[PDB]
Amino acid sequence: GPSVFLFPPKPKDTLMISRTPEVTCVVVDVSQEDPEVQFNWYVDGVEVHNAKTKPREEQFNSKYRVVSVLTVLHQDWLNGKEYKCKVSNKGLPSSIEKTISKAKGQPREPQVYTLPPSREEMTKNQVSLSCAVKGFYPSDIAVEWESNGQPENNYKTTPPVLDSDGSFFLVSKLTVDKSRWQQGNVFSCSVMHEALHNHYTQKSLSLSGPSVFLFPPKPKDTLMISRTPEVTCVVVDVSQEDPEVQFNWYVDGVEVHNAKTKPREEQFNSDYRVVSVLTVLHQDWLNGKEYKCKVSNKGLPSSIEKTISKAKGQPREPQVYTLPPSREEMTKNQVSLWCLVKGFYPSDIAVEWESNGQPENNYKTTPPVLDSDGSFFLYSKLTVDKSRWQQGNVFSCSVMHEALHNHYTQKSLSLS
Ligand SMILES: [Zn+2]
Ligand SMILES: [Zn+2]
């Protein structure tokens, strides 16, 4: 069955007026018995004939991909015009049309702050320089570093993360040799976002069909031995005409019988979802046992098996470092406290915040981000009133991860 994806321009092409933003239309799983693939393109419903259609690519499975690319105008894309790819191919019945546009809503301007390395990181050979960007909308953004006119390429940026006020934040982490930091070198975080002046700013930093899903347990369940980690097998789009749905569960190939199936849950389209939940022992999950859910139903041809397990590889202990606000943030009502956690494997982690023995719930965390050494890092951002920060109140970042002692650490952060 041939499918259609439509991808938006890359953010930095849409933000720099000298580059050529393009939307790409991609047809996957084109059988060899049947191209040709016809592309029609619409801008706000007006055909446009300029699109360029590449020759068909081989996939790893002997069916073809066909990509059509439409360059779009810096203004039109930012002014939120709609690009419609229609795809006509015999052995598709009819036509698949996808529409894309930029996200709607008043743009918001990012606040960009650079944050130095934590004193605790000043014993390593390398040190981490941060660029918090927050308060931006929409989420399209490109971040880059430089020093002294030269690209600094040793950086990883988190994807944008929705915050409580409907705006996004991310953090960018540039890794440098400490001597360079310690010698005075000047480092700049280059942000491009539509709602900046000239879409550009720079801040400097220098020494002061029924389908099956199988979900893994929640990380915090897997890391505190007093909770009950569980795998979840979900059958989706079950026809009213055909349950019953039977579940079979295997732990490294041995059937177990301790799974609890729920009653069918109504979906938004009048087919059903069935969920079976299998508790797992803390020591089995961390030790790498494989959980197989087999699903059987008459709306299927025979069976669907999914296998999940914990990611394989030598666990790596995280380094947890708290960062106080940027000085430039101190002119706000509310201020950002940072927990950088880095150098952890596998990616399964939980972060939380507390002060004075009470949970602080006004925080978002980034997803784990793959670093270049194969470890993961993220940041967590707690936003507190500034009076609390300047009164000297003490904040703790709690980090749960298999490779810590007891699977837990806390770092404090208070006014210097
Ligand atoms: Zn512009
Ligand atoms: Zn344990």
Side-chain angles (χ1 to χ4, degrees), residues 314-326:
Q314 185 48 238
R316 301 214 233 165
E317 182 163 331
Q319 304 167 51
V320 178
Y321 301 121
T322 52
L323 317 176
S326 172

Side-chain angles (χ1 to χ4, degrees), residues 222-223 225 282-283 286 407:
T222 62
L223 296 172
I225 183 169
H282 164 94
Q283 287 97 5
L286 293 180
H407 311 308

Side-chain angles (χ1 to χ4, degrees), residues 148-159:
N148 207 14
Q150 319 291 332
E152 294 283 320
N153 280 306
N154 193 9
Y155 69 82
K156 287 296 177 164
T157 299
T158 68

Side-chain angles (χ1 to χ4, degrees), residues 1-5 25-39 53-68 85 87-93 96:
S3 340
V4 180
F5 301 101
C25 190
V26 182
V27 189
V28 162
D29 295 306
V30 172
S31 79
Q32 201 172 118
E33 227 256 317
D34 288 329
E36 204 109 62
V37 187
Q38 288 135 322
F39 284 90
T53 292
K54 305 204 226 294
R56 74 177 180 193
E57 306 184 350
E58 282 182 7
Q59 293 186 152
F60 291 105
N61 48 84
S62 99
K63 277 183 144 92
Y64 291 69
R65 176 197 313 118
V66 193
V67 188
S68 183
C85 175
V87 172
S88 266
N89 165 205
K90 246 59 93 170
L92 212 62
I96 301 310

Side-chain angles (χ1 to χ4, degrees), residues 35-228:
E36 204 109 62
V37 187
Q38 288 135 322
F39 284 90
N40 303 108
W41 276 104
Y42 310 84
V43 172
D44 285 335
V46 191
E47 220 178 340
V48 298
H49 302 278
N50 30 330
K52 301 141 191 140
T53 292
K54 305 204 226 294
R56 74 177 180 193
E57 306 184 350
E58 282 182 7
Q59 293 186 152
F60 291 105
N61 48 84
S62 99
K63 277 183 144 92
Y64 291 69
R65 176 197 313 118
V66 193
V67 188
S68 183
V69 183
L70 176 68
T71 87
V72 317
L73 294 183
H74 159 100
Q75 289 78 13
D76 293 344
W77 169 277
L78 291 188
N79 290 353
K81 301 194 179 213
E82 287 204 351
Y83 308 81
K84 177 152 93 154
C85 175
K86 190 163 65 141
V87 172
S88 266
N89 165 205
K90 246 59 93 170
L92 212 62
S94 180
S95 303
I96 301 310
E97 302 188 354
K98 302 271 144 143
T99 298
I100 203 177
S101 68
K102 188 206 68 175
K104 309 158 125 83
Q106 179 55 232
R108 304 221 232 156
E109 187 181 355
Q111 313 149 48
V112 180
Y113 306 102
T114 63
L115 307 174
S118 156
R119 47 174 52 253
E120 318 307 341
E121 193 186 24
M122 298 295 255
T123 91
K124 286 301 190 318
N125 260 279
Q126 298 211 308
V127 129
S128 332
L129 309 191
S130 302
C131 195
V133 186
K134 73 199 212 77
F136 64 108
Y137 192 89
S139 71
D140 308 285
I141 200 160
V143 186
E144 309 197 347
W145 286 87
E146 63 182 46
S147 165
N148 207 14
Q150 319 291 332
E152 294 283 320
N153 280 306
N154 193 9
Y155 69 82
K156 287 296 177 164
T157 299
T158 68
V161 176
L162 187 62
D163 202 349
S164 14
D165 71 351
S167 85
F168 296 79
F169 76 95
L170 56 75
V171 191
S172 190
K173 179 161 85 53
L174 170 57
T175 296
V176 304
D177 294 342
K178 187 200 198 180
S179 58
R180 291 181 69 215
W181 186 248
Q182 276 178 292
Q183 242 145 46
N185 293 5
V186 178
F187 294 94
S188 323
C189 178
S190 288
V191 190
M192 298 143 264
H193 186 266
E194 71 158 279
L196 292 175
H197 204 88
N198 306 295
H199 306 322
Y200 186 79
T201 199
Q202 196 181 230
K203 304 297 205 211
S204 287
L205 179 54
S206 112
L207 182 80
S208 59
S211 350
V212 177
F213 299 88
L214 186 54
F215 295 111
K218 289 185 216 201
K220 181 173 180 171
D221 292 354
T222 62
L223 296 172
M224 294 160 74
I225 183 169
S226 81
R227 313 188 120 177
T228 85

Side-chain angles (χ1 to χ4, degrees), residues 234-240 262-275:
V234 187
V235 191
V236 146
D237 311 322
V238 175
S239 75
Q240 198 177 119
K262 298 202 259 258
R264 71 171 172 179
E265 306 177 13
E266 276 185 31
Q267 296 196 148
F268 288 112
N269 60 103
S270 95
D271 284 311
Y272 293 72
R273 165 198 327 131
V274 189
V275 181

